[PDB]
Design an enzyme around this catalytic site. Structure first.
Site, PDB file in Angstrom:
ATOM      1  N   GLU A   1     -10.783  -6.559  -5.180  1.00  0.00           N
ATOM      2  CA  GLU A   1     -10.694  -7.559  -4.115  1.00  0.00           C
ATOM      3  C   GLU A   1     -11.987  -7.553  -3.313  1.00  0.00           C
ATOM      4  O   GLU A   1     -12.254  -6.572  -2.601  1.00  0.00           O
ATOM      5  CB  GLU A   1      -9.501  -7.278  -3.192  1.00  0.00           C
ATOM      6  CG  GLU A   1      -9.358  -8.319  -2.065  1.00  0.00           C
ATOM      7  CD  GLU A   1      -8.079  -8.170  -1.272  1.00  0.00           C
ATOM      8  OE1 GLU A   1      -7.145  -7.487  -1.746  1.00  0.00           O
ATOM      9  OE2 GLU A   1      -8.012  -8.750  -0.165  1.00  0.00           O
TER      10      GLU A   1
ATOM     11  N   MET B   1       2.691  -5.972  -7.855  1.00  0.00           N
ATOM     12  CA  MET B   1       1.386  -5.441  -7.494  1.00  0.00           C
ATOM     13  C   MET B   1       1.548  -4.316  -6.489  1.00  0.00           C
ATOM     14  O   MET B   1       2.431  -4.357  -5.630  1.00  0.00           O
ATOM     15  CB  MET B   1       0.483  -6.577  -6.947  1.00  0.00           C
ATOM     16  CG  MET B   1      -0.971  -6.204  -6.618  1.00  0.00           C
ATOM     17  SD  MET B   1      -1.121  -5.493  -4.939  1.00  0.00           S
ATOM     18  CE  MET B   1      -1.070  -6.987  -3.947  1.00  0.00           C
TER      19      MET B   1
ATOM     20  N   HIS C   1     -11.615 -14.619   2.490  1.00  0.00           N
ATOM     21  CA  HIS C   1     -12.774 -13.745   2.327  1.00  0.00           C
ATOM     22  C   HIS C   1     -13.977 -14.507   1.798  1.00  0.00           C
ATOM     23  O   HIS C   1     -15.095 -14.329   2.303  1.00  0.00           O
ATOM     24  CB  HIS C   1     -12.422 -12.581   1.406  1.00  0.00           C
ATOM     25  CG  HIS C   1     -11.454 -11.621   2.022  1.00  0.00           C
ATOM     26  ND1 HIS C   1     -10.972 -10.517   1.355  1.00  0.00           N
ATOM     27  CD2 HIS C   1     -10.865 -11.614   3.246  1.00  0.00           C
ATOM     28  CE1 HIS C   1     -10.125  -9.870   2.145  1.00  0.00           C
ATOM     29  NE2 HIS C   1     -10.040 -10.518   3.292  1.00  0.00           N
TER      30      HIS C   1
ATOM     31  N   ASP D   1      -4.904 -13.836  -3.682  1.00  0.00           N
ATOM     32  CA  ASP D   1      -4.397 -13.711  -2.314  1.00  0.00           C
ATOM     33  C   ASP D   1      -4.592 -15.035  -1.588  1.00  0.00           C
ATOM     34  O   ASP D   1      -5.733 -15.494  -1.426  1.00  0.00           O
ATOM     35  CB  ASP D   1      -5.118 -12.614  -1.527  1.00  0.00           C
ATOM     36  CG  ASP D   1      -4.621 -11.212  -1.834  1.00  0.00           C
ATOM     37  OD1 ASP D   1      -3.693 -11.026  -2.646  1.00  0.00           O
ATOM     38  OD2 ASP D   1      -5.173 -10.283  -1.218  1.00  0.00           O
TER      39      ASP D   1
ATOM     40  N   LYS E   1     -14.781  -8.695  -0.322  1.00  0.00           N
ATOM     41  CA  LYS E   1     -14.796  -9.143   1.073  1.00  0.00           C
ATOM     42  C   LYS E   1     -16.216  -8.924   1.564  1.00  0.00           C
ATOM     43  O   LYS E   1     -16.798  -7.880   1.239  1.00  0.00           O
ATOM     44  CB  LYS E   1     -13.795  -8.361   1.939  1.00  0.00           C
ATOM     45  CG  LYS E   1     -13.669  -8.934   3.362  1.00  0.00           C
ATOM     46  CD  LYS E   1     -12.672  -8.141   4.219  1.00  0.00           C
ATOM     47  CE  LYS E   1     -12.463  -8.838   5.561  1.00  0.00           C
ATOM     48  NZ  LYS E   1     -11.530  -8.052   6.421  1.00  0.00           N
TER      49      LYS E   1
ATOM     50  N   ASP F   1     -11.939 -12.133  10.028  1.00  0.00           N
ATOM     51  CA  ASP F   1     -10.899 -12.397   9.026  1.00  0.00           C
ATOM     52  C   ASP F   1      -9.597 -12.801   9.721  1.00  0.00           C
ATOM     53  O   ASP F   1      -8.898 -11.958  10.290  1.00  0.00           O
ATOM     54  CB  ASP F   1     -10.736 -11.122   8.203  1.00  0.00           C
ATOM     55  CG  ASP F   1      -9.836 -11.263   6.996  1.00  0.00           C
ATOM     56  OD1 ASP F   1      -9.649 -12.361   6.444  1.00  0.00           O
ATOM     57  OD2 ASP F   1      -9.289 -10.208   6.604  1.00  0.00           O
TER      58      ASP F   1
ATOM     59  N   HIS G   1       0.845  -1.196   0.000  1.00  0.00           N
ATOM     60  CA  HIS G   1       0.000   0.000   0.000  1.00  0.00           C
ATOM     61  C   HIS G   1       0.878   1.243   0.000  1.00  0.00           C
ATOM     62  O   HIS G   1       1.966   1.243   0.586  1.00  0.00           O
ATOM     63  CB  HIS G   1      -0.876   0.086   1.260  1.00  0.00           C
ATOM     64  CG  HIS G   1      -1.793  -1.077   1.460  1.00  0.00           C
ATOM     65  ND1 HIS G   1      -1.393  -2.227   2.104  1.00  0.00           N
ATOM     66  CD2 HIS G   1      -3.107  -1.246   1.167  1.00  0.00           C
ATOM     67  CE1 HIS G   1      -2.411  -3.072   2.163  1.00  0.00           C
ATOM     68  NE2 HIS G   1      -3.459  -2.504   1.596  1.00  0.00           N
TER      69      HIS G   1
ATOM     70  N   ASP H   1       2.170   1.987   3.417  1.00  0.00           N
ATOM     71  CA  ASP H   1       3.158   1.066   3.981  1.00  0.00           C
ATOM     72  C   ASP H   1       4.571   1.559   3.712  1.00  0.00           C
ATOM     73  O   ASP H   1       5.490   1.321   4.508  1.00  0.00           O
ATOM     74  CB  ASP H   1       3.036  -0.316   3.349  1.00  0.00           C
ATOM     75  CG  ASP H   1       1.747  -1.027   3.690  1.00  0.00           C
ATOM     76  OD1 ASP H   1       1.141  -0.768   4.751  1.00  0.00           O
ATOM     77  OD2 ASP H   1       1.335  -1.831   2.840  1.00  0.00           O
TER      78      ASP H   1
ATOM     79  N   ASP I   1      -1.447 -12.907   1.559  1.00  0.00           N
ATOM     80  CA  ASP I   1      -1.985 -11.845   2.408  1.00  0.00           C
ATOM     81  C   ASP I   1      -2.330 -12.538   3.726  1.00  0.00           C
ATOM     82  O   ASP I   1      -3.403 -13.127   3.869  1.00  0.00           O
ATOM     83  CB  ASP I   1      -3.221 -11.188   1.774  1.00  0.00           C
ATOM     84  CG  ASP I   1      -3.667  -9.959   2.533  1.00  0.00           C
ATOM     85  OD1 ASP I   1      -3.056  -9.664   3.577  1.00  0.00           O
ATOM     86  OD2 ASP I   1      -4.638  -9.301   2.095  1.00  0.00           O
TER      87      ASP I   1
ATOM     88  N   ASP J   1      -6.721 -14.431   8.492  1.00  0.00           N
ATOM     89  CA  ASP J   1      -5.472 -14.267   7.736  1.00  0.00           C
ATOM     90  C   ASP J   1      -4.374 -15.206   8.247  1.00  0.00           C
ATOM     91  O   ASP J   1      -3.229 -14.807   8.465  1.00  0.00           O
ATOM     92  CB  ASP J   1      -5.001 -12.809   7.771  1.00  0.00           C
ATOM     93  CG  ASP J   1      -5.856 -11.890   6.912  1.00  0.00           C
ATOM     94  OD1 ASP J   1      -6.681 -12.368   6.095  1.00  0.00           O
ATOM     95  OD2 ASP J   1      -5.713 -10.657   7.074  1.00  0.00           O
TER      96      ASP J   1
ATOM     97  N   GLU K   1      -9.510 -13.546  -2.355  1.00  0.00           N
ATOM     98  CA  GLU K   1      -8.725 -14.000  -1.205  1.00  0.00           C
ATOM     99  C   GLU K   1      -9.387 -15.217  -0.568  1.00  0.00           C
ATOM    100  O   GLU K   1     -10.592 -15.190  -0.307  1.00  0.00           O
ATOM    101  CB  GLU K   1      -8.579 -12.897  -0.151  1.00  0.00           C
ATOM    102  CG  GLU K   1      -7.748 -13.338   1.048  1.00  0.00           C
ATOM    103  CD  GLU K   1      -7.574 -12.250   2.116  1.00  0.00           C
ATOM    104  OE1 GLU K   1      -7.917 -12.509   3.285  1.00  0.00           O
ATOM    105  OE2 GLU K   1      -7.112 -11.140   1.782  1.00  0.00           O
TER     106      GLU K   1
HETATM  107 MG   LIG Z   1      -6.248  -9.471   0.640  1.00  0.00          MG
HETATM  108 MG   LIG Z   2      -8.247 -11.224   4.879  1.00  0.00          MG
END
Ligand SMILES: [Mg+2]
Ligand SMILES: [Mg+2]
Ligand SMILES: [Mg+2]
Ligand SMILES: [Mg+2]
Ligand SMILES: [Mg+2]
Ligand SMILES: [Mg+2]
Ligand SMILES: [Mg+2]
Ligand SMILES: [Mg+2]
Lengths: 385, 385, 385, 385
Positions: free
Chosen positions: A179, A86, A218, A243, A181, A253, A52, A55, A285, A255, A215
């Site tokens: 993306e 990406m 998700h 992802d 979610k 979520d 991002h 980031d 991710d 992850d 993802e």
């Molecule tokens: Mg993701």
């Molecule tokens: Mg996630």
């Protein structure tokens, strides 16, 4: 099961860099310098990193500070050989985005969200990214009257159309990936599944520029079959990026590292990506759990890649087994691939073997042999053959 | 709160006619003659009825028996003034469909499924139906290797393309509506949500002929927001029909009477359908619980219509309240409806108030006032104003 | 991975005997004679079978017909060496049980339910069963006013107290096991999880006579961790029996063969049962999918036992690996087993190292090393070491 | 619908004081001084407030700073008349608790957790609290090998036994309430539901000192019926306290204001609490959404109390309606309250009307009339009578 950069494994800076702050707890790890993450991921055998804007460049950075952050980052990429395939925009952390970016009720926030995005598209192209991801994490609502969803979809289409006008006018060779979610951090998020995102793309002005970035976790937050959704995205020609992570059912979520969560679904996913010839990045991710110190961070990242490579070997062994190939014929997977009526509508209407003289009871008695086939898949996954 | 045929309330023959057989129990009610159901629904104020082929004509009927079943049915429609706005095909009960109809692995089953469908399309047109629904309840899988989903989607597209060729060659004025469901009776069903169905339609040869028939309880089996999904279908111009009922969260398909289950979601749904001017049937796909005798069957059917009419009154009162209209302006719903950048991309790029001189902290401090708005909606729903 | 009767694998007559009728479809398989099922299960290496009264003796059988059904069954047990370790009552199929058995609103139905149960307890003892299971599948409600749950729990306690009075007065050596399920076929079922059932047992007059019969798929229908719930039942001394199968998340009760569904949860379950020394039957309550013919029925039953034996080998290899034993010490599983304060309350209050001089920052910095441990478990499950 | 302190509405300091930091976003509101919250809640008609130790006294405060924080707080209570009926311990925010407090693998962390708790029990008693709540939010695991649950339950029992020894030795008149939650922030949390917590309490040394503090949204995160679980807690005599809020199904813990989420479940909950004569606090554990400014914070808190009072009026009207009272008799709720077999076991065994001469077909034909009853409840909830 050692990864090489040819395996195309990539990681977000925000993944190994997650400090462990959750809604009920403070951070358990100190912040990682992006340059150190690039170095440590290269030693593990990763192919590249993603980011991002916020980031890489702290929010509110002067142009001068911005230039030095990028310069340091580029030097680490040159020293290691890592790529940046990406990039994406943070339109969710800052309080100004509390009701969305592209679909915020306030018009001035929506215009700001577009300018923030456009500025990072320029940076992404400069660093060589081929795909630009959009995760609309704040686009949605907690209550029914807060958001007229038809107007919100108008605003969402307007934003993505403007972004496509920008990249085409600049001559950029970059494509967009949406993306989905279903929820979290908003009570319901717009475009909540792969399906909703694919349908939305077909109403954009230049649909060829947009695909999906699904993802694992998700789609599983809606209880859906992730390999099935990936198959529909591939069928539509829209799997631009993916992802990879793990999720234990319908809840927040998680992850988790890839291979954790639903292990059989991970096997069928790898089988599909490899069989279909998906050639994009295998992006993770994921969040190393906040129980871990930095040694555990790198162990968890290594485990992502190891689990992909183990599953790749087992799926390949499954498809190459002559006994599995005859079980697939026994279950008529070969007939599924053959047209129902290549003879055409009129010939079907005139075919008495298709209705008037069709023996429905004899056809109904034929077993599908799916359980034998599935136990062969289980034996291969577990290395019991 | 008395329904009239002008309210366009319709019921499937299979709804009030459900005998109460569930996976763990035998039937608790005797079978209803379709003619009696038509008569009893007309007295309750319904507008019309819908049917599967096998609801009206027992499977395996000779042409002679078929003609008399239709003749009896048509006489009941003439005696009562009831209409038949929708019909559909049973491709799920008979054992021959145990692995699907349009996407069965066996090619001869797929051809039979098409012929069975085409024969009922002719009947539907004869009885005046405007919409033909397809619910692929057996299209899917319990295990990963049983179904190659890309091949299955090829077969699904092939079937719907052939059906569109048939209606256009016959000159029929009928349109198709695809009914999604995420699971049950298969472990996962293909096209599991409104979104997946909308995306699939855009790959058919004549997309203008196909829309969706979403069901309240089905989207809620994936934990999704049903009014949001309906809004996306309306935005796409694809809400051809709708199935109304109730569901208490993520579990088996309950098919409760409309208004049961998630009551607030029912309020926001009625608000949206009435505001958008949806002019199709308000169809109830519900099951009177098997605890009930026939008096309870008709009480439950009456309750479907009563609850729609109560919610319609409360949503209208909500939107007409001047205090609600100022709360909507306080939450900037008016700004959501205004274009983000009608001045165009270049003007946005040149606008320093959109980025360089945008005061993000002042914008972030503005409350959305969504909780006051939502309590006004709660007060209106409960008749506390 | 060949099962022997010493592995104590058992199957319900209703499992391999399921004809494939689901809520949307007719049966796909013909009915199996109980004698044939006993013979075929013995050849696969099963230890024994279980039954509902109505599986063995068709409902409404005369005493004379009843005696011959039992006589035939007993001869098959004698010819094969199969045992009958568990029996149960069907209080859910017949329409009279549509609102429950023990907690039906009608008092005469509740008395009938008790008499039907008592008559099968006598048969179970005659055939040598050690455990009598109760699954209250119809005890519950679809609507809030239909069932006062405090009164229903009074009636449920009254029924189980009467059953305990009966077995103690007859001098029977049999114990009861309550099987929880959160929903289906009722909208909500009373005692919906292992926890609720354990809590209820402590209010019975003779709690020592009652334990739980948890089922993998049922706890997963509430999104719960099945190995965690089994651990609490073992901790309480109440795991009298267990039902093994597979389930893919929160949806209808799938009853897949064991090892399907959540594979990692199956691994941790087998690890726990074997480590704890559970010595009861490994019972499979599963349904061969209705896609299958009889060859697929027996393949699916064989797969239940095979998957248990594979997981047993991998869990044993995990616990015996010296590298895993040092990882467990690295994650302080040894300290979890040591008392927090065996020195007592006063010594804890006087211990300045426990608060005044405790270095919270140094303790917080210690990583738990859980991700390395979990990847060692993944490698062992997959046979990658 | 104006609240008075006699309605016993209470709020946690952490509820209206939540600054809006979620896992993907920074705070949107500034911190509230506890003294201001007490003042503002008293003007809205609240009865009192509750606190975690770290809400009132910042972590790491010197004894001198601690005394002044309490002194300021006590003055605000004296100026307003607010009470403090409940207090609790923060054993989840600080990094030292990343693997739990009472069940952390590290023994020194477990001893610290006990000392931190004991110090706040003394403060709670000084401020007049009658109930001390424990929410073990960090007790649990993300992976199977990280936590031996039998050892963890041993440590959990050891901690609560030591706390009961402390309060009895000090002569305190305070009782404990355990708050269950199925997941979040850990992947699975120990004692995940009301049932598991009730079962655990029966193994403590002094069970009379412990009950439950159930939360609406937490049981709904497992898809369970919250009024049913409350009924079981009341039946057991263990409902010591209750947390009221709203939740839209199985997802992250939303903590919406009470009445949002599942509105019908809120109606049946209020009906039960009022009918049963629950006399404890009506406590709101909720978060004003981070879209809101401080005006929206107080609107959302006011809405909690308003919705309780509206539902209380509608449930009372439902139970007092003579037409509802005859519908309850029509559905045999009166028979549910009558003993099944007060004549005893032998009389039941000798009663031929209970089996030999029981007419099962006539009983099965009796409808339950549940749908009419439920529509009467819907009409009352909506003020349509
Ligand atoms: Mg993701
Ligand atoms: Mg996630
Ligand atoms: Mg349905
Ligand atoms: Mg439907
Ligand atoms: Mg089951
Ligand atoms: Mg079972
Ligand atoms: Mg909560
Ligand atoms: Mg709480």
């Amino acid at each position: 099961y050692q990864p090489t950069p040819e395996d195309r494994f990539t990681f977000g800076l925000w993944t190994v860099g997650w400090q462990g702050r959750d809604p009920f707890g403070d951070a358990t790890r100190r912040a990682l310098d992006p340059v150190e993450s690039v170095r440590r991921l290269a030693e593990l055998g990763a192919h590249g990193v993603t980011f991002h804007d916020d980031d890489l460049i702290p929010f509110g950075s002067s142009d001068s500070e911005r230039e030095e952050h990028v310069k340091r980052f580029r030097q680490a990429l040159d020293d290691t050989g890592m790529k940046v395939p990406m990039a994406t925009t943070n339109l969710f952390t800052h309080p100004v985005f509390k009701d969305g970016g592209f679909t915020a009720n306030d018009r001035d926030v929506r215009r700001y969200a577009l300018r923030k995005t456009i500025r990072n598209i320029d940076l992404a192209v400069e660093l060589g990214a081929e795909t630009y991801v959009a995760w609309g994490g704040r686009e949605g609502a907690e209550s029914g009257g807060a958001k007229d969803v038809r107007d919100a979809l108008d605003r969402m289409k307007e934003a993505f159309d403007l972004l496509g006008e920008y990249v085409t006018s600049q001559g950029y060779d970059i494509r967009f990936a949406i993306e989905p979610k279903p929820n979290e951090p908003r009570g319901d998020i717009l475009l909540p599944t792969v399906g909703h995102a694919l349908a939305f793309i077909e109403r954009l002005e230049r649909p060829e520029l947009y695909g999906v970035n699904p993802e694992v976790g998700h789609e599983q937050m809606a209880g859906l079959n992730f390999p099935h959704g990936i198959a529909q995205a591939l069928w539509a020609g829209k799997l631009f990026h993916i992802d990879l992570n793990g999720q234990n059912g319908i809840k927040y979520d998680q992850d988790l590292r890839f291979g954790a969560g639903d292990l059989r679904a991970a096997f069928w996913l790898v089988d599909l990506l490899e069989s279909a010839g998906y050639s994009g990045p295998r992006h993770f991710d994921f969040k190393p759990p906040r129980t871990e110190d930095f040694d555990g961070v790198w162990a968890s990242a290594a485990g992502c890649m190891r689990n992909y490579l183990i599953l790749k070997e087992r799926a390949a062994a499954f498809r190459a087994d002559p006994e599995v190939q005859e079980a697939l014929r026994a279950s008529r997977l070969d007939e599924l691939a053959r047209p129902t009526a290549a003879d055409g509508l009129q010939a079907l209407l005139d075919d008495r073997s298709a209705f008037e003289e069709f023996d429905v009871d004899a056809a109904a008695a034929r077993g599908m042999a799916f359980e034998r086939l599935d136990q062969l898949a289980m034996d291969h996954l577990l290395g019991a053959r």
